[PDB]
């Protein structure tokens, strides 16, 4: 097996590709003679207002973000701090695409490309996304680079609100959490021991108990404690 | 009688008063609703409404 | 505009199937490169098909992740819509207060 | 052979062996299915779709989980060969038969922990596919008698009485308790359109999660004591316009 | 440490939009794996290492060929459950109002 996999190494580099400058050119032709980058920011923002269909305007939003992320992994092209060049541009885009629509189309498309392209280093991405202040809402709703962006004291409020409002059962364990729901449970048991008819309508008092502690979310352990606690005052006459 | 028994137990004792500290500072630390101190004249007056 | 939940999920039967047919053709290719009793041109012409399908596969995995984020924002709006949005719709208000009294 | 037609022969095979089984639905809610009623090959996974092939070089018990779930969803829809009333109970009977088969054939797995995640997965399929609060209270006697099967988490031998191997942030109850707390909040928001069967469904489901968990589980006894704000003994349909101008009488 | 009003509401929006999709994240693992392996054969770097999944095997690639058929049938069957379970909550809501 080790000899035949050297055949594939020769067959990959021989005939297959030219390093793509002519095949792969999305919206940028070259870096230097085209450069015009403050004014090239507007000519891509010019046609991006007059786009109607959402498919063909998001084929463009997708191919606009792909060629940038392959461009950062290679370095020393013209200037080192090109990360602030793109991050100044995208802040103009998000404030304009919140004007014509009410969504975050340019925001969510930034998350989907930053998660999928299998050449990017993850440490380089968090250094870029921290600087843009207009996309911090979309990072906290979505994919996981907001965990490393989160403050260490602010992390102990995540560990408390996750298992309080997603995992904690919403039931009421004391007699003060529902003074209305426990007040009708006792008065229904006071009533049931003052009936002459108490063996013909047993099952008419259970179906009113289950409708009381379903409407008000009463506990099932504290409720059996209240039934055994009221029915011990009336144990001399009604124990059947 | 259910919600008067709590005003007695929460003004007098100070471990019950310290338990409701944590449940209001954990759910919002920057709290607009405030309970922070003694309220001592309201301690003696509120214990007379019990 | 707004998107309907029954069609927002109906698109993700189709957006998932247009990504499934791209994944199956690539595993067809790598089966040819693995077989021992292969030949000189069958390994050559099949690898010529490979960077074509690599570009469409990565291009369809953004759309699968973009359409997932759309439903989570859409069915957290439905979770607020439940309530008394539909309560103030009945035009029979006199009989529904005589029944409760 | 194609992997898809391997599945399609298996669903039609399970329809044969589960139809001939002579048990009712009123006898399956209370008494469990006896393990000596099926053939000895079915509890060991030597099936007629799985003998003619040799191409099962992959997992076997991760393939069974997709057959048993596609058999359930294809048993809850189709009702249009006979009259509808007997056709609703034939959906739920094929559910409870296929859910006793996961418990009985748990030694014949390749893993005695790979049935604790299959039993909670198929049980959450039943609750979503079930369409009404009237049909919920018809099925739920199945899930109250077989409650000691839920506590034996990845252990083939049963827990004794009162012991439960279920903690609230681990693989069975980590994504299910987040999902069953949505139904219990979905049913709490409509405080106008709730019938009396919607309040009985909220009781039988919340009582089920309390017995599953220990009495000392941090998400069980309302640890952060929050007084309710929804204790409302009020009807909006009994109220017209909320008048505050004729303050005459006592 | 300070806690500001805007730094508290960045906690609560992470709490709302936190989902646990187990069949969806299992399928994106397979899409993430195959796009790594075939992203190296275009360059040529394939070696007997543990950074990728498998190198080249008629038995091990045939494992991923049937693990892509099983993980697709599970996501397709978990999207037909969400269609049904929101369909008959609307009719039950309407047959109470009507």
| CB-CB contact of E74 with D66 (8 Å) | yes
Mutation choice for D interface testing from A214, A216, A222 by most D CBs within 10 A: A214
| CB-CB contact of D141 with D30 (8 Å) | yes
Those residues whose C-beta lies under 8 Å from the C-beta of residue A173, and which sit 6 or more positions away, are A219, A221, A222, D221, D222, D225
Number of Cβ pairs < 8 A linking chain A and chain D: 78
Please tell me the distance from the alpha carbon of residue A51 to that of residue A155, in angstroms, as a whole number: 42
Q: Kindly write down the DSSP assignment for every residue of C28-74, as one continuous string.
A: HHHHHTT-SS--TTHHHHHHTTHHHHHHHHHHHHHHHHHHHHHHHHH
Please name which of A195, A63, A173, A198 lies closest in space to residue A117, comparing C-alpha atoms.
A63
Chains that touch D (3 or more CB pairs under 8 A): A, B, C, E
Per-residue CA distances from D33 to A46, D22, D102, D135 (Å):
70, 11, 11, 22
Q: What is the resolution of this structure in A?
A: 3.2
| CB-CB contact of D166 with D150 (8 Å) | yes
Angle at D153 between CA D149 and CA D154, to 5 degrees: 110
**What method was applied to determine this entry?**
cryo-EM
Hey, is the C-beta of B35 within 8 angstroms of any chain D C-beta?
Answer: no
The answer to whether the Cβ–Cβ distance between A116 and C36 falls below 8 Å is no
The answer to whether the Cβ–Cβ distance between D225 and B26 falls below 8 Å is no
Question: In the structure, how many helices (H) and strands (E) does chain D have?
Answer: 8, 0
Those residues whose C-beta lies under 8 Å from the C-beta of residue D171, and which sit 6 or more positions away, are D117
Please tell me the distance from the alpha carbon of residue D71 to that of residue D90, in angstroms, as a whole number: 13
Tokens at D81, concatenated: 């060969």
Residues 7-36 of B with CB under 8 A from A: 26-27, 29
Please name which of D179, C59, C69, B28 lies closest in space to residue A137, comparing C-alpha atoms.
C69
Residue A218, helix vs strand vs coil? strand
Per-residue CA distances from A118 to A63, A109, C7, D246, E49 (Å):
15, 16, 31, 73, 18
Please tell me the distance from the alpha carbon of residue D6 to that of residue C90, in angstroms, as a whole number: 52
Hey, is the C-beta of D73 within 8 angstroms of any chain E C-beta?
Answer: yes
CB-nearest to C66 from A12, A108, A118 is A108
The answer to whether the Cβ–Cβ distance between E88 and D132 falls below 8 Å is yes
Please name which of D25, D122, D146 lies closest in space to residue D71, comparing C-alpha atoms.
D122
Those residues whose C-beta lies under 8 Å from the C-beta of residue D129, and which sit 6 or more positions away, are D72, D73, D76, E81, E84, E85
Residue A172, helix vs strand vs coil? strand
Please tell me the distance from the alpha carbon of residue A10 to that of residue A29, in angstroms, as a whole number: 31
| CB-CB contact of D122 with D76 (8 Å) | no
From A181, which residue of chain B is nearest by alpha-carbon distance? B2
Strand partners, A218: A172
Residue A128 CB-half CA count within 13 A: 24
Neighbours of D168 (CB within 10 A): 20
**Structural Rg of chain B based on CA atoms:** 12
Neighbours of B32 (CB within 10 A): 5
Residue A209 CB-half CA count within 13 A: 19
From A118, which residue of chain C is nearest by alpha-carbon distance? C58
User: What DSSP character marks residue A146?
Assistant: G
The values of phi and psi at residue D78, to 5°, are -70, 120
Residues 5-24 of B with CB under 8 A from D: 19-20, 23
Neighbours of C67 (CB within 10 A): 17
Please tell me the distance from the alpha carbon of residue D153 to that of residue D165, in angstroms, as a whole number: 6
Tokens at D244, concatenated: 């505050």
| CB-CB contact of D141 with D28 (8 Å) | no
The values of phi and psi at residue A53, to 5°, are -75, 145
**Interior/surface letters E58-95, b for 16+ CB within 10 angstroms, e for the rest:** eeebbebbbbbbbbbbbbbbbbeeeebbeeebeebeee
Mutation choice for A interface testing from C66, C70, C76, C79 by most A CBs within 10 A: C66
Please tell me the distance from the alpha carbon of residue D207 to that of residue D209, in angstroms, as a whole number: 6
Mutation choice for B interface testing from D218, D222, D224 by most B CBs within 10 A: D224
The answer to whether the Cβ–Cβ distance between D238 and C100 falls below 8 Å is yes
From D240, which residue of chain C is nearest by alpha-carbon distance? C97
Please name which of D187, C18, E8, C96 lies closest in space to residue B29, comparing C-alpha atoms.
E8
Q: Which residue has the tokens 């599970």?
A: E74
Residues of A in contact with C33 (CB under 8 A): 8
From A157, which residue of chain B is nearest by alpha-carbon distance? B26
Please tell me the distance from the alpha carbon of residue D132 to that of residue E88, in angstroms, as a whole number: 8
Number of Cβ pairs < 8 A linking chain A and chain B: 14
| CB-CB contact of D131 with E88 (8 Å) | yes
Residues in chain E: 98
Residues of B in contact with A160 (CB under 8 A): 26
From A179, which residue of chain B is nearest by alpha-carbon distance? B2
Hey, is the C-beta of A183 within 8 angstroms of any chain B C-beta?
Answer: yes
Hey, is the C-beta of B6 within 8 angstroms of any chain A C-beta?
Answer: yes
The values of phi and psi at residue D67, to 5°, are -70, -45
Those residues whose C-beta lies under 8 Å from the C-beta of residue D75, and which sit 6 or more positions away, are D90, D91, D94, D95
Please tell me the distance from the alpha carbon of residue A15 to that of residue C51, in angstroms, as a whole number: 13
Quote helix, strand, coil % in chain B, to nearest 5.
50, 0, 50
Mutation choice for D interface testing from A159, A160, A168 by most D CBs within 10 A: A168
Q: What's the farthest any 2 CA atoms get from each other in chain E?
A: 68
Neighbours of A148 (CB within 10 A): 10
Residues of E in contact with C30 (CB under 8 A): 37-38, 56, 61
Per-residue CA distances from D12 to D5, D16, D28, D37 (Å):
11, 7, 23, 20
Residues of D with CB under 8 A from a CB of B: 224-226
Please tell me the distance from the alpha carbon of residue A213 to that of residue C41, in angstroms, as a whole number: 76
The answer to whether the Cβ–Cβ distance between E93 and D190 falls below 8 Å is yes
Residues of A in contact with B7 (CB under 8 A): none
| CB-CB contact of D236 with C87 (8 Å) | yes
Please name which of A178, A156, A172 lies closest in space to residue A219, comparing C-alpha atoms.
A172
Q: Does chain B touch chain C (at least 3 C-beta pairs within 8 Å)?
A: no
Beta strand ranges found along chain A (DSSP E)? none
Please name which of A22, B30, D163 lies closest in space to residue E3, comparing C-alpha atoms.
B30
The answer to whether the Cβ–Cβ distance between C93 and D240 falls below 8 Å is yes
Strand partners, A172: A218
* CA torsion through residues B6, B10, B16, B17, sign: positive
Q: Cα E89 from chain centroid?
A: 26
| CB-CB contact of D168 with D218 (8 Å) | yes
Q: Cα E84 from chain centroid?
A: 21
Tokens at D240, concatenated: 């017209």
Per-residue CA distances from A161 to C93, E12, E20 (Å):
42, 8, 16
CB-nearest to A160 from B2, B3, B26 is B26
Those residues whose C-beta lies under 8 Å from the C-beta of residue C16, and which sit 6 or more positions away, are C64, E72, E75, E76, E79
Distance in angstroms between the alpha carbons of the first and the last residue of chain B: 9
Those residues whose C-beta lies under 8 Å from the C-beta of residue A58, and which sit 6 or more positions away, are A105, A109, C66
């Amino acid at each position: 097996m080790a000899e035949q996999t050297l055949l594939s190494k020769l067959n990959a580099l021989s005939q297959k590709v030219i390093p793509p400058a002519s095949p792969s050119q999305a919206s940028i032709l070259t870096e230097e003679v085209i450069r015009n980058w403050p004014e090239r920011s507007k000519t891509l923002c010019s046609d991006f207002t007059a786009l109607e269909s959402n498919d063909e305007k998001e084929d463009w939003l997708r191919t606009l973000f792909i060629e940038l992320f392959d461009f950062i992994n290679k370095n020393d092209e013209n200037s080192p701090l090109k990360l602030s060049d793109v991050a100044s541009f995208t802040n103009e885009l998000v404030n304009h695409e919140r004007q014509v629509s009410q969504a975050s189309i340019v925001g969510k498309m930034f998350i989907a490309v930053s998660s999928t392209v299998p050449n990017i280093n993850d440490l380089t991405t968090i250094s870029l996304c921290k600087l843009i202040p207009s996309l911090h809402e979309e990072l906290f709703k979505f994919s996981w680079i907001s965990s490393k962006l989160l403050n260490k004291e602010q992390t102990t409020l995540l560990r408390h609100l996750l298992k309080k409002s997603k995992y904690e059962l919403k039931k009421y364990n004391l007699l003060v959490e529902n003074s209305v729901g426990y007040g009708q449970l006792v008065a229904l048991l006071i009533l049931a021991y003052y009936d002459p008819d108490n063996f013909s309508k047993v099952s008419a008092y259970l179906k009113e108990i289950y409708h009381i502690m379903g409407k008000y979310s009463l506990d099932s352990i504290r409720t059996l404690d209240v039934i055994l606690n009221v029915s011990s005052q009336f144990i001399t006459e009604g124990y059947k | 009688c259910f919600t008067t028994n709590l005003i007695r137990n929460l003004i007098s004792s100070d471990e019950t008063r310290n338990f409701y500290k944590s449940c209001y500072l954990r759910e919002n630390p920057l709290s607009d609703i405030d309970f922070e101190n003694l309220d001592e004249v309201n301690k003696k007056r509120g214990l007379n409404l019990c | 505009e707004g998107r309907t939940y029954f069609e927002s999920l109906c698109e993700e039967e189709q957006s998932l199937q247009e990504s499934q047919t791209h994944l199956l053709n690539i595993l067809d290719i790598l089966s040819v490169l693995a077989d021992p009793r292969s030949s000189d041109d069958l390994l050559t012409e099949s690898l010529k098909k490979l960077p074509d399908l690599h570009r469409e596969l990565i291009n369809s995995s953004i759309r699968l992740r973009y359409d997932k984020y759309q439903t989570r924002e859409a069915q957290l709006l439905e979770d607020t819509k439940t309530g008394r949005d539909v309560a103030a719709g009945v035009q029979n208000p006199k009989s529904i207060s005589e029944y409760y009294s | 052979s194609n992997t898809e037609e391997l599945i399609q022969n298996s669903i039609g095979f399970l329809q044969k062996t589960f139809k001939a089984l002579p048990v009712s639905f009123d006898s399956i809610r209370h008494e469990p299915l006896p393990s000596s009623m099926l053939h000895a090959s079915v509890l060991n996974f030597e099936w007629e779709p799985l003998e003619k092939n040799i191409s099962a070089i992959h997992d076997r018990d991760s393939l069974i989980d997709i057959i048993l779930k596609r058999f359930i969803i294809d048993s809850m829809t189709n009702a249009i060969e006979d009259e509808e009333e007997n056709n609703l109970e034939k959906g739920l009977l094929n559910s409870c038969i296929g859910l006793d088969f996961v418990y009985n054939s748990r030694f014949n797995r390749s893993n005695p922990a790979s049935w604790g995640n299959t039993f909670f997965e198929l049980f959450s399929t039943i609750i979503d596919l079930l369409n009404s609060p009237s049909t919920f209270l018809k099925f739920w006697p199945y899930a109250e008698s077989r409650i000691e099967w839920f506590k034996m988490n990845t252990s083939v031998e049963p827990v004794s009485l009162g012991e439960s191997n279920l903690i609230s942030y681990k693989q069975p109850l980590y994504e299910k308790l987040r999902h069953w707390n949505d139904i219990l909040a979905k049913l709490e928001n409509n405080d106008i359109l709730n019938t009396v069967k919607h309040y009985n469904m909220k009781y039988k489901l919340e009582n089920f999660l309390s017995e599953l968990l220990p009495i000392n589980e941090e998400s069980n006894f309302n640890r952060s004591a929050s007084i309710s704000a929804l204790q409302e003994s009020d009807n909006e349909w009994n109220r017209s316009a909320r008048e505050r101008e004729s303050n005459r009488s006592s | 440490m300070p806690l500001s009003q805007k730094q508290i509401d960045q906690v609560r929006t992470k709490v709302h939009y936190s989902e646990v999709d187990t069949p969806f994240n299992k399928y994106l693992d397979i899409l993430g794996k195959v796009t790594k392996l075939t992203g190296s054969i275009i360059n040529g770097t394939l070696s007997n290492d543990d950074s990728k999944i498998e190198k080249l095997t008629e038995q091990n690639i045939s494992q991923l060929k049937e693990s892509a058929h099983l993980r697709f049938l599970d996501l397709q069957s978990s999207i037909d459950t969400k269609k049904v379970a929101d369909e008959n909550w609307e009719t039950c809501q309407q047959e109470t109002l009507a």
